[PDB]
Scaffold this active site. Structure first.
Site, PDB file in Angstrom:
ATOM      1  N   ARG A  64       0.560  -1.267   0.195  1.00 34.45           N
ATOM      2  CA  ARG A  64      -0.156  -0.375  -0.148  1.00 34.45           C
ATOM      3  C   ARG A  64       0.587   1.206   0.183  1.00 34.45           C
ATOM      4  O   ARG A  64       0.519   2.265  -0.415  1.00 34.45           O
ATOM      5  CB  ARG A  64      -0.995   0.034   1.170  1.00 34.45           C
ATOM      6  CG  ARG A  64      -2.624  -1.131   0.753  1.00 34.45           C
ATOM      7  CD  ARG A  64      -3.274  -0.418   2.099  1.00 34.45           C
ATOM      8  NE  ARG A  64      -2.863  -1.372   2.974  1.00 34.45           N
ATOM      9  CZ  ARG A  64      -3.352  -2.002   3.559  1.00 34.45           C
ATOM     10  NH1 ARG A  64      -3.679  -2.789   3.708  1.00 34.45           N
ATOM     11  NH2 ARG A  64      -2.640  -2.221   5.480  1.00 34.45           N
ATOM     12  N   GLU A 101       2.357 -10.182  14.906  1.00 28.23           N
ATOM     13  CA  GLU A 101       1.406 -10.706  16.303  1.00 28.23           C
ATOM     14  C   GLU A 101       2.482 -11.820  16.918  1.00 28.23           C
ATOM     15  O   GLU A 101       2.596 -11.701  17.418  1.00 28.23           O
ATOM     16  CB  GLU A 101      -0.041 -10.805  15.690  1.00 28.23           C
ATOM     17  CG  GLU A 101      -0.281 -11.077  17.530  1.00 28.23           C
ATOM     18  CD  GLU A 101      -1.777 -10.935  16.570  1.00 28.23           C
ATOM     19  OE1 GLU A 101      -2.041 -10.723  15.730  1.00 28.23           O
ATOM     20  OE2 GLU A 101      -2.875 -11.038  18.058  1.00 28.23           O
TER      21      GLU A 101
END
Ligand code: NA
Ligand code: NA
Lengths: 181, 178
Positions: A64, A101
């Site tokens: 992005r 994570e």
């Protein structure tokens, strides 16, 4: 006008509840990418802000980031250098790590694309924890690039990206801000 | 426009794309074009002039090198940019299509609408599997695609013919021999 462009920009970004997992809000820039007005103004506003700054390269991080850093490079008439997920760049690279994570991943940059004297602006869609931008900045600096600015469409201040960048000698700039809640 | 300026620009664009032996095949590396402001702005300017009369309403690019050419062209045409992505990255409703290596590509269902005339823009026509899938995604949402645009065409890999027997006009700035 500028103040109005920003609100138009902020309203073009949709908020998706319980994405990826539940009780998490996701801001979707793709609703901005399909609004020709909002998308051009975002690139106009980021460009104009760095006109007086003497930038020689823009770096954007896959994927992005490509969508904001590359048009900014085009508007400033300077080169675009991509920072990539592992195993995509064909020429000699260096590597930096950053936390997810559940693990760790890496970003790479071409060693020939930055050198001493380059003044580098990082442009990205989203300042969240700031781990990818931290890794990107270390890449640029290991090659002698000077980086003092990072520019974002979206800022998430409750994740403390801003102060973590400040700690590393980066002043952050963003168009719009959203709360985590 | 002068057909001889055009030829000059296209040559300068071709000369700025570097070549890499036995990575990954002869690898044609578009990153050298990206870091040359004149080659890069000129590739966008060329692609988008080619289509400014065509009544395009949307540009689609595939992640991730597609983003580098499709979004600037969207911007230059003044139309929406719509990304086709790897699995798991798009947040709204998506549909999905398969291409081989095998994997899927996704696109938002609310981003293509019947009536849309869509130009696909990508960095490189190799074997053409990503593009085949991207066209199906668009057509299933009621968009018309007849037009796919490339910086680089590699015909020996057979992309161009594979696109033909799917309904698609190919346009490339440059091509190279295998
Ligand atoms: Na270097
Ligand atoms: Na639709």
């Amino acid at each position: 006008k500028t103040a109005q462009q920003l609100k138009y920009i902020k309203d073009s970004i949709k908020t998706i509840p319980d994405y990826p997992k539940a009780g998490i809000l996701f801001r979707d820039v793709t609703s901005l990418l399909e609004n020709p007005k909002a998308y051009s103004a975002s690139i106009e506003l980021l460009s104009e802000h760095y006109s007086e700054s003497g930038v020689t390269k823009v770096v954007g991080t896959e994927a992005r980031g490509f969508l904001f850093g590359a048009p900014v490079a085009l508007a400033l008439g300077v080169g675009f250098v991509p920072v990539r997920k592992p195993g995509k760049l064909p020429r000699e690279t260096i590597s930096e790590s950053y936390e997810l994570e559940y693990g760790t991943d890496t970003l790479e940059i071409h060693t020939d694309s930055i050198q001493p004297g380059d003044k580098v602006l990082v442009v990205d869609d989203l300042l969240a924890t700031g781990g990818t931008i931290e890794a990107t900045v270390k890449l640029i600096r290991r090659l002698g690039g000077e980086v003092v600015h990072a520019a974002f469409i979206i800022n998430l201040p409750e994740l403390g990206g801003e102060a973590r960048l400040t700690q590393q000698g980066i002043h952050c700039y963003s168009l719009v801000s959203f709360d985590g809640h």
